[PDB]
Amino acid sequence: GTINVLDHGAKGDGTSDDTKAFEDAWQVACKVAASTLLVPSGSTFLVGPVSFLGKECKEKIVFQLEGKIIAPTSASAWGSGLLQWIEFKALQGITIKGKGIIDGRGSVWWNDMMGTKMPRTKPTALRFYGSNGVTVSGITIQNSPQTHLKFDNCISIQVSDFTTSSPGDSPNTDGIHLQNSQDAVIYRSTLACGDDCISIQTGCSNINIHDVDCGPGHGISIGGLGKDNTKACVSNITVRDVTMHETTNGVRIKSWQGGSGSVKQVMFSNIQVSNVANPIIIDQYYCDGGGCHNETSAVAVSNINYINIKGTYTKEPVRFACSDSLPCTGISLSTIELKPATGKASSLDPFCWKAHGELKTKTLPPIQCLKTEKSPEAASRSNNDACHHH
Numbered sequence: 001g002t003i004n005v006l007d008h009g010a011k012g013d014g015t016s017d018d019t020k021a022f023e024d025a026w027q028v029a030c031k032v033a034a035s036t037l038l039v040p041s042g043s044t045f046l047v048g049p050v051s052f053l054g055k056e057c058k059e060k061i062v063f064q065l066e067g068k069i070i071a072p073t074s075a076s077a078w079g080s081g082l083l084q085w086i087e088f089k090a091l092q093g094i095t096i097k098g099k100g101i102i103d104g105r106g107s108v109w110w111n112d113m114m115g116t117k118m119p120r121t122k123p124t125a126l127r128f129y130g131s132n133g134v135t136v137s138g139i140t141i142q143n144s145p146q147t148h149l150k151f152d153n154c155i156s157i158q159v160s161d162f163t164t165s166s167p168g169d170s171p172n173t174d175g176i177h178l179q180n181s182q183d184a185v186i187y188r189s190t191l192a193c194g195d196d197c198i199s200i201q202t203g204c205s206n207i208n209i210h211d212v213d214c215g216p217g218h219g220i221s222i223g224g225l226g227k228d229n230t231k232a233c234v235s236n237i238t239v240r241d242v243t244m245h246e247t248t249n250g251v252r253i254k255s256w257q258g259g260s261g262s263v264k265q266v267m268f269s270n271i272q273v274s275n276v277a278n279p280i281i282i283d284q285y286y287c288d289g290g291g292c293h294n295e296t297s298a299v300a301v302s303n304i305n306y307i308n309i310k311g312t313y314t315k316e317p318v319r320f321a322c323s324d325s326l327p328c329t330g331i332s333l334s335t336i337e338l339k340p341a342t343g344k345a346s347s348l349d350p351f352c353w354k355a356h357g358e359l360k361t362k363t364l365p366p367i368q369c370l371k372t373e374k375s376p377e378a379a380s381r382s383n384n385d386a387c388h389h390h
């Protein structure tokens with residue numbers, strides 16, 4: 001009963017455009033609950049921008065990716081907008097699974113070889129929008145133009161046995177990006193990236209990441225939150241049993257001066273860092289790609305917990321750089337064993353600026369700069385949070 005794309009006009013030769021064939025197979029699957037669309041092992045499919053749209057589609061469809069999907073490598077063959085690659089939208093209980101590969105052939109973008117002036121933000125390889133019950137398992141996304149996998153306005157997400165592979169020096173190739181999404185578990189995954197391995201943006205809550213290896217890349221980050229004086233709301237984030245190998249950061253929270261809202265109830269636990277520049281970082285002066293001035297509003301950071309984080313570092317081992325007008329509160333550290341990878345790093349002390357919290361154990365290196373007193377300043381800004389849904 002499986003709907004093989006080769007039975008719907010796909011050539012599977014890696015040179016003929018099979019987009020229409022994939023759209024036609026999708027229309028077949030869309031009408032049948034629990035149907036399976038197979039992209040078969042042993043074949044490679046050139047597929048351009050495509051949206052598997054599904055408000056009228058039935059539930060529990062399986063998109064079984066066992067072969068390889070490759071992106072076009074010219075502006076003409078891409079087509080209009082350059083605004084997306086593969087999208088699934090407005091689906092219920094959709095699953096993408098299999099041991100196949102999505103290859104964005106992203107070097108044509110990274111090297112400015114597309115035959116057109118490129119957009120600042122290049123297409124995400126695989127994006128889910130507006131869907132309830134999303135499973136991504138098994139597949140590998142390699143050489144994405146920019147972001148590998150994105151969830152936007154999705155609820156009830158499971159990502160497992162999943163791999164990204166883009167070069168560590170490829171520009172902006174973050175692994176998994178979540179925005180306005182809730183109730184997600186990401187596990188048993190391997191993320192080699194040129195940017196954040198996972199980044200969690202505004203609107204996210206109840207995100208659980210465990211049994212993940214990150215590297216190369218920039219670590220696991222919340223943010224950058226609040227850019228362009230916007231409200232950001234993030235809560236209930238857990239990261240457990242993760243390794244970061246030669247990444248620029250370990251676990252990071254980044255927010256922009258002038259943002260509002262809050263990030264609260266975050267747990268970073270059982271983290272191993274190897275040769276990581278900045279293992280632990282909260283940065284409320286983040287401004288990569290923008291202006292680096294201060295403002296009187298901040299995203300309120302509170303109730304951030306670090307437990308059992310160990311390994312080696314090359315820059316400041318710990319940096320809590322919080323807003324002058326809204327100090328971070330409720331930072332807690334336990335069982336921190338960070339050792340300098342070099343003689344130079346051994347002279348770099350923890351840095352705390354406007355950061356309140358507690359040490360539950362002695363730490364290596366000692367963190368002497370967290371303030372134990374409460375912050376009336378932080379509390380006085382509470383009306384700027386207004387993340388009521390969190």
Ligand SMILES: *[C@@H]1O[C@H](CO)[C@@H](O[C@@H]2O[C@H](CO)[C@@H](O[C@@H]3O[C@H](CO[C@H]4O[C@H](CO[C@H]5O[C@H](CO)[C@@H](O)[C@H](O)[C@@H]5O)[C@@H](O)[C@H](O[C@H]5O[C@H](CO)[C@@H](O)[C@H](O)[C@@H]5O)[C@@H]4O)[C@@H](O)[C@H](O[C@H]4O[C@H](CO)[C@@H](O)[C@H](O)[C@@H]4O)[C@@H]3O)[C@H](O)[C@H]2NC(C)=O)[C@H](O)[C@H]1NC(C)=O
Nearest residue numbers: 285292293294321322324347348349350351352353368369
């Ligand atoms: C936007 O707003 C932000 C926030 O206000 C603003 O950034 C702040 O700018 C101020 C002013 O420039 C900064 O404060 C200054 O920081 C100077 C550097 O301090 C760091 O380095 C010191 C030296 O460290 C080296 O050497 C030591 C050996 O001594 C070694 O161990 C270290 O590892 C490192 O190699 C260090 O002492 C200092 O550490 C103290 O402070 C930190 C942070 O609180 C804390 O973690 C430590 O425990 C310790 O308390 C820090 O690491 C510093 O020299 C300078 O101090 C002089 O002036 C003050 C008064 O201003 C005097 O009280 C003091 O006695 C000195 O005379 C001052 O503290 C601040 O760090 C910035 N904050 C951030 C987050 O960047 C931006 O400029 C604004 N931007 C715009 C565009 O407006």
Ligand SMILES: *[C@@H]1O[C@H](CO)[C@@H](O)[C@H](O)[C@H]1NC(C)=O
Nearest residue numbers: 205206234235236265389390
């Ligand atoms: C996060 O979970 C805790 C514990 O279940 C709860 O107190 C809090 O309200 C939750 N926040 C959300 C779902 O935004």
